[PDB]
Design an enzyme around this catalytic site. Structure first.
Site, PDB file in Angstrom:
ATOM      1  CG  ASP A  61      -1.445  -1.371   1.575  1.00  0.00           C
ATOM      2  OD1 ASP A  61      -2.562  -1.709   1.129  1.00  0.00           O
ATOM      3  OD2 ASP A  61      -0.744  -2.116   2.291  1.00  0.00           O
ATOM      4  CE1 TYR A  63       6.951   4.015   2.844  1.00  0.00           C
ATOM      5  CE2 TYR A  63       6.946   4.992   0.655  1.00  0.00           C
ATOM      6  CZ  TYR A  63       7.525   4.161   1.597  1.00  0.00           C
ATOM      7  OH  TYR A  63       8.681   3.475   1.292  1.00  0.00           O
ATOM      8  CG  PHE A  74       9.276  -0.140  -1.680  1.00  0.00           C
ATOM      9  CD1 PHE A  74       9.189  -0.441  -0.330  1.00  0.00           C
ATOM     10  CD2 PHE A  74       9.085  -1.155  -2.601  1.00  0.00           C
ATOM     11  CE1 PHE A  74       8.913  -1.727   0.092  1.00  0.00           C
ATOM     12  CE2 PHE A  74       8.806  -2.445  -2.185  1.00  0.00           C
ATOM     13  CZ  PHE A  74       8.722  -2.731  -0.837  1.00  0.00           C
ATOM     14  CG  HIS A 183       8.826  -6.589   3.784  1.00  0.00           C
ATOM     15  ND1 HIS A 183       9.274  -5.486   4.477  1.00  0.00           N
ATOM     16  CD2 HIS A 183       7.884  -6.135   2.924  1.00  0.00           C
ATOM     17  CE1 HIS A 183       8.628  -4.413   4.059  1.00  0.00           C
ATOM     18  NE2 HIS A 183       7.779  -4.780   3.115  1.00  0.00           N
TER      19      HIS A 183
END
Length: 219
Positions: A61, A63, A74, A183
């Site tokens: 998703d 920020y 990102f 991750h």
């Protein structure tokens, strides 16, 4: 001849698509803050035309803080300090290719290199993580991934984390390469992101397919 307009033409027809857009709109009219701005929702596709795609990086998703999200996975706007995950991504990139750690976290240069920075959900309500994860975006972004199955060229997918790795089942084209790793978040329970050297591997693979490598350098 193959563009996002043509490969997503049919999916765009789906009534659920406009309904997602309509929902986000009415939310903004209700005074709620939603990131990114409405005109930035599809920047990933805008900055990386279908036929230019070489590498695909999946996020979850946008920020949920002010001035952060701008339509790329990102990536954060200029002037914004790179968040933990992105910071760790830079750490790996530096160790992997020797590329200097950027003074920022703005990744448009990657998108222009042919890196599709795609989140699963394209909007989020301010201060509420995953708040728009179940409104239907996943239908559409899954289709974006599937549309790559018909791509003439071989694509390298960088799947970080369990969530992103699930999407591998959508990738049925054997010309494509799938690279998996934990991750990038320095808090994620599973260590292993550091050392996977996905950036150098990606360039090796692109070279072997005569596509041309990614310049990961930022400045």
């Amino acid at each position: 001849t193959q563009t996002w307009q043509t490969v997503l033409g049919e999916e765009k027809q789906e009534p659920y698509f406009q309904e997602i857009l309509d929902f986000v709109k009415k939310e903004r009219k209700a005074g709620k803050i939603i990131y990114p701005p409405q005109k930035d929702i599809f920047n990933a596709l805008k900055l990386t035309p279908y036929e230019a795609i070489k590498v695909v990086i999946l996020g979850q998703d946008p920020y949920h803080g002010p001035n952060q999200a701008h339509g790329l996975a990102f990536s954060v706007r200029p002037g914004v300090p790179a968040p933990p995950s992105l910071q760790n991504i830079f750490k790996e990139l530096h160790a992997d290719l020797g590329v200097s750690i950027p003074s920022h976290g703005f990744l448009e240069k990657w998108a222009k290199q042919g890196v599709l920075l795609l989140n699963a959900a394209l909007t989020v309500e301010a201060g509420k993580p995953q708040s728009h994860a179940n409104i239907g975006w996943h239908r559409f972004t899954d289709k974006v991934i599937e549309s790559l199955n018909d791509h003439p060229e071989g694509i390298v997918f960088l799947l970080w984390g369990s969530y992103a790795q699930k999407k591998s089942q959508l990738i049925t084209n054997l010309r494509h390469r799938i690279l998996k790793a934990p991750h990038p978040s320095p808090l994620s329970a599973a260590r292993g992101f550091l050392g996977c050297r996905h950036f150098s591997k990606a360039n090796q693979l692109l070279h072997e397919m005569g596509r041309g490598e990614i310049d990961w350098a930022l400045d």
